[PDB]
Amino acid sequence: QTVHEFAKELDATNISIDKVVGAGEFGEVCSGRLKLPSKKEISVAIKTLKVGYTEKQRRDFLGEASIMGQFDHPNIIRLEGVVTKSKPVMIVTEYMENGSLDSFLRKHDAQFTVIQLVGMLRGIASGMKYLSDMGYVHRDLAARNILINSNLVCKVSDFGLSRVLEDGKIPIRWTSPEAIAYRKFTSASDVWSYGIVLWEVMSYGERPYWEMSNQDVIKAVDEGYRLPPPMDCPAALYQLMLDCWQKDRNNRPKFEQIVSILDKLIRNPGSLKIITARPSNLLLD
């Protein structure tokens, strides 16, 4: 309806659903296959809109597809197309065999090399660089919203909270202090969130701020407290977290700078060899 500006209408005869692999906000998530016009067949994720949906649910469902379809980048989840002319309504995206990054890393605690983790993080930063170039603030950047494929390539997903930079419930643990305080959302608030993702990745999917009260996460961060170095975290990476978490948003790096920093670490792996008693669990500064 509005989604066809940025989404191909797919012929449902080209979609084969293999298995229900999950449950989304708007209906089930399945995996399956898509036959392309060239007769190449690819694996896909298939999201369906629940039977008996409301007009609101349809608009929200397809609206997220409308945003995703605006981006064509190797580190942003690819929209293959939608099915709207038949029901159930569907959103078809590239298949990511290893699922959400946080859940994946929790299964593999301490099992990857620092260079592998840095590769993941560089891909995330590269996708965010493009999203921010396109004028979007994600507002939900978190490891649970990064998907990871069979070759460990990481891709930004979940555009439900995303919006264009122009004149309800928030992911408090991932949100910048200024965005919590007065809804000041900017690409620099996404850079804050990226710092949290960096901590999640280096922590193999530990929950940011563990189970601290939301009120205490807000107060502590505002007072200058920061999540502590993950075990065996390269100094360069902890410093990057701290830079992403600067109180003054103008002092945070841009996504382009983050990509550049990570690229230098990948190119000089010896850099990563320098590795990180306090009066509290969070570290002041």
Partner: peptide, 8 residues
């Protein structure tokens, strides 16, 4: 999830 909340 307890990941998303209002401020009270």
């Amino acid at each position: 999830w307890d990941n998303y909340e209002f401020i009270w």
